[PDB]
């Protein structure tokens, strides 16, 4: 069978919709992981600071309290692995495969997070 | 609004690490359970899906929620049908579950992706199995066309066409779909509705229930005065199940912890049935329905009730501790993108065997040309007939050899 396919392809084609990363000037501060440029990252990429903390928690067994701009989280971890983590967050955690859009906002629809983009309107499932 | 239950069964099969469960979820609604005590037991996908069409053509009509406010229609949708999706993994090792699904299924869904090699063995094997177990309704689906250019997809399609020529199944629709976009599901629904003629089920032949997953549905820290029975999540092959039946579990469990295997089967009684959202009395076959039986929460755990069968008092499912398998060997080992010839069997070595619905490790006793005898460690049974697929140790993870038949 090779007749109802071209139309579908056409339809697919029709429905189709880095400088934004801030330079991080941070050296490997020991004992406790401290970040002062985290606020800027939160601002520019448009995301809540608590989400980043949650992500960090998910990644590694660290204990710390939230401080309002510069965070106090226990752990002697490297400046390049944090960078890698940030890169990962920028990539396969947020953004979209079909469109490379900037503005993504937080909405909750059952209990786990389902992030939405403001440029068009499409839902994606992120957990891993 | 009072909603009807499932009568027609739809199954989805493909290849490992491609994504099937996710696709199923996208098609349906709420997230599946499988893949400490709850949810996980054996790899399967279960969720409720709704067939409510709005006619006031093309492709777009269907939606996720019952309240429809997406394309441009204010009112309700007309009554068509309801479905509960059952998903089986497309692994060269996990085959018993697929086989089980096959007998049950009324509609089939096949998946091929454009990121690996073109000539495929596992898919072919699956097709052969389908052909064998009296099935004709097959639907071909395309997995991922997101980073692809323009011509590669076309080439792939051409290759597929070339491949499917000398086969039994011909009446097949080809739809290219996405899993994560949450669009292009209405078209699929439409296809499911239109192209397939709906078959009815008969309740005269002897009833069978195949439990793949075991559950304990309670709050973590349940009180003694209010205790619910152990729910057995099983797919029904044939025979309508109603409230008030004496159920038995077949294969038997190792209770002494010298080692004996000969013991009586375990009997249990139904408390309540869990289907769709609201509670129902009767259970229509074709789907994975939670049968709440009087079984302990301690008994249902992880690697003991994998593929244990359920039947009414005084029945015909056969108990096995030692299994008879008649194997047909292929020319060469298939699955690699290096190729090796199939060697003759060697005594006393651990290999994984798949019959009925069970996926468990076994030991080799005797060496022959066509037949084999194997000793089982964890509970296993054979239903009516069904095919066999063997998986052997070659390199780290288990690999396929071919197909087999059961004489008993």
From Swiss-Prot, chain A:
Zinc finger C4-type: from-to: 96-120
GO biological-process terms attached to the record: formation of translation preinitiation complex; translational initiation
Gene Ontology cellular component list: cytosol; eukaryotic 43S preinitiation complex; eukaryotic translation initiation factor 2 complex; multi-eIF complex; ribosome
Keywords attached to this entry: Cytoplasm, Initiation factor, Metal-binding, Phosphoprotein, Protein biosynthesis, Zinc, Zinc-finger
Compartments (UniProt record): Cytoplasm, Cytosol
GO MF term list: mRNA binding; translation initiation factor activity; translation initiation factor binding; zinc ion binding
Subunit-level organization: Eukaryotic translation initiation factor 2 eIF2 is a heterotrimeric complex composed of an alpha, a beta and a gamma subunit. The factors eIF-1, eIF-2, eIF-3, TIF5/eIF-5 and methionyl-tRNAi form a multifactor complex (MFC) that may bind to the 40S ribosome. Interacts with GCD6. Interacts with GCD1. Interacts with TIF5/eIF-5. Interacts with CDC123.
Protein family (similarity comment): Belongs to the eIF-2-beta/eIF-5 family.
Function description: Component of the eIF2 complex that functions in the early steps of protein synthesis by forming a ternary complex with GTP and initiator tRNA. This complex binds to a 40S ribosomal subunit, followed by mRNA binding to form a 43S pre-initiation complex (43S PIC). Junction of the 60S ribosomal subunit to form the 80S initiation complex is preceded by hydrolysis of the GTP bound to eIF2 and release of an eIF2-GDP binary complex. In order for eIF2 to recycle and catalyze another round of initiation, the GDP bound to eIF2 must exchange with GTP by way of a reaction catalyzed by eIF2B.
Protein name: Eukaryotic translation initiation factor 2 subunit beta
Encoding gene per record: SUI3
From Swiss-Prot, chain B:
Keyword Hydrolase: yes
UniProt KW keywords: Cytoplasm, GTP-binding, Hydrolase, Initiation factor, Nucleotide-binding, Phosphoprotein, Protein biosynthesis
GO cellular component terms, semicolon-separated: cytosol; eukaryotic 43S preinitiation complex; eukaryotic 48S preinitiation complex; eukaryotic translation initiation factor 2 complex; multi-eIF complex; ribosome
Location of the tr-type G domain: 5-201
Phosphoserine PTM sites in chain numbering: 152
GO molecular function, one term: GTPase activity
Annotated region (G2), positions in chain: 39-43
UniProt-annotated location(s): Cytoplasm, Cytosol
Residues given in the record as GTP binding sites: 17-22, 143-146, 178-180
Effect of residue 212 to L: Mildly impairs eIF2 complex function. No effect on cell population growth
EC numbers for this chain: 3.6.5.3
Domain of life, source organism: Eukaryota
Disruption phenotype: Inviable.
Enzyme kind, highest EC tier: hydrolase
Record keyword RNA-binding present: no
Residue segments, region G4: 143-146
Effect of residue 46 to H: Reduces the affinity of eIF-2 for Met-tRNAi(Met) without affecting the k(off) value for guanine nucleotides
Role played: As a subunit of eukaryotic initiation factor 2 eIF2, involved in the early steps of protein synthesis. In the presence of GTP, eIF-2 forms a ternary complex with initiator tRNA Met-tRNAi and then recruits the 40S ribosomal complex and initiation factors eIF-1, eIF-1A and eIF-3 to form the 43S pre-initiation complex (43S PIC), a step that determines the rate of protein translation. The 43S PIC binds to mRNA and scans downstream to the initiation codon, where it forms a 48S initiation complex by codon-anticodon base pairing.
Known partners and oligomeric status: Eukaryotic translation initiation factor 2 eIF2 is a heterotrimeric complex composed of an alpha, a beta and a gamma subunit. The factors eIF-1, eIF-1A, eIF-2, eIF-3, TIF5/eIF-5 and methionyl-tRNAi form a multifactor complex (MFC) that may bind to the 40S ribosome. Interacts (via C-terminus) with CDC123; the interaction is direct. Interacts with GCD1. Interacts with the eIF2B complex subunits GCD6 and GCD7. Interacts with methionyl-initiator methionine tRNA.
Entry's family note: Belongs to the TRAFAC class translation factor GTPase superfamily. Classic translation factor GTPase family. EIF2G subfamily.
Additional information: Present with 20800 molecules/cell in log phase SD medium.
Name of the featured protein: Eukaryotic translation initiation factor 2 subunit gamma
Provenance organism: Saccharomyces cerevisiae (strain ATCC 204508 / S288c) (Baker's yeast)
Shown chain mapped onto the complete sequence: 94 to 519 of 527
């Amino acid at each position: 069978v090779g007749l109802p396919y071209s139309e579908l392809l056409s339809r697919f084609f029709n429905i189709l919709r880095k400088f934004r990363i801030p330079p991080p000037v941070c050296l490997r501060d020991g004992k406790k992981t401290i970040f002062s440029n985290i606020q800027d990252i939160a601002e520019k990429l448009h995301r809540s600071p608590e989400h980043l903390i949650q992500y960090l928690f998910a990644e590694l067994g660290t204990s710390g309290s939230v401080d309002g701009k510069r965070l106090v989280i226990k752990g002697k971890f490297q400046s390049k692995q944090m960078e890698n983590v940030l890169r990962r967050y920028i990539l396969e955690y947020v953004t979209c495969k079909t469109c490379k859009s900037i503005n993504t906002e937080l909405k909750r629809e059952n209990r786990l997070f389902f992030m939405v983009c403001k440029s068009c309107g499409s839902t994606r499932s992120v957990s891993s | 609004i009072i909603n009807r239950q499932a009568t027609i069964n739809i199954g989805t099969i493909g290849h490992v690490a491609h994504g099937k469960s996710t696709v199923v979820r996208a098609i349906s609604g709420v997230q599946t359970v499988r893949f400490l005590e709850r949810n996980i037991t054996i790899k399967l996908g279960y969720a409720n899906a709704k067939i409510y069409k709005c006619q006031e053509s093309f492709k777009s009509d269907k939606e996720i929620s019952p309240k429809c406010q997406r394309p441009g229609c204010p009112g309700r949708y007309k009554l068509v049908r309801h479905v509960s999706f059952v998903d089986c993994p497309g692994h060269d090792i996990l085959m018993s579950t697929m086989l089980s699904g096959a007998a049950v299924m009324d509609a089939a869904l096949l998946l091929i992706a454009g990121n690996e090699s073109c000539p495929q063995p596992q898919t072919s094997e699956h097709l052969a199995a389908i052909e064998i177990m009296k099935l004709k309704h097959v639907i071909i689906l395309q997995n991922k066309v997101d980073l692809m250019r323009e011509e590669s997809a076309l080439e792939h399609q051409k290759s597929i066409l070339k491949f499917i020529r000398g086969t039994i199944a011909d009446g097949a629709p080809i739809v290219p779909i996405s899993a994560q976009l949450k669009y292009n599901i209405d078209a699929v629904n439409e296809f499911i509705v239109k192209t397939i003629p709906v078959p009815p089920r008969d309740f005269m032949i002897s009833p069978r229930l195949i439990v793949i997953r075991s559950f304990d549905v309670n709050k973590p820290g349940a009180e003694i005065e209010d205790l619910k029975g152990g729910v057995a999540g099983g797919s029904i092959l044939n025979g309508v199940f109603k409230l008030g039946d004496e159920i038995e579990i077949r294969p038997g469990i190792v209770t002494k912890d010298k080692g004996k295997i000969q013991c009586k089967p375990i009997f249990s009684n139904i408390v309540s049935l869990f289907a769709e959202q609201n509670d129902l009395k009767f259970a229509v076959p074709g789907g994975l329905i939670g049968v709440g039986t009087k079984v302990d929460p301690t008994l249902c755990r992880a690697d003991r009730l994998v593929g244990q069968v359920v039947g009414a008092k005084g029945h015909l499912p056969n108990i096995y501790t030692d299994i008879e398998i008649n194997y047909f060997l292929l020319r060469r080992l298939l699955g690699v993108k290096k190729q090796a010839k199939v060697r003759k069997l060697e005594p006393n070595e651990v290999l994984m065997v798949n019959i009925g619905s069970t996926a468990t490790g076994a030991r080799v006793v005797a060496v022959k040309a066509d037949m084999a005898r194997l000793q089982l460690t964890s509970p296993a049974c054979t239903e009516i007939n069904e095919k066999i697929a063997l998986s052997r140790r070659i390199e780290k993870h288990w690999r396929l050899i071919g197909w087999a038949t059961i004489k008993k």
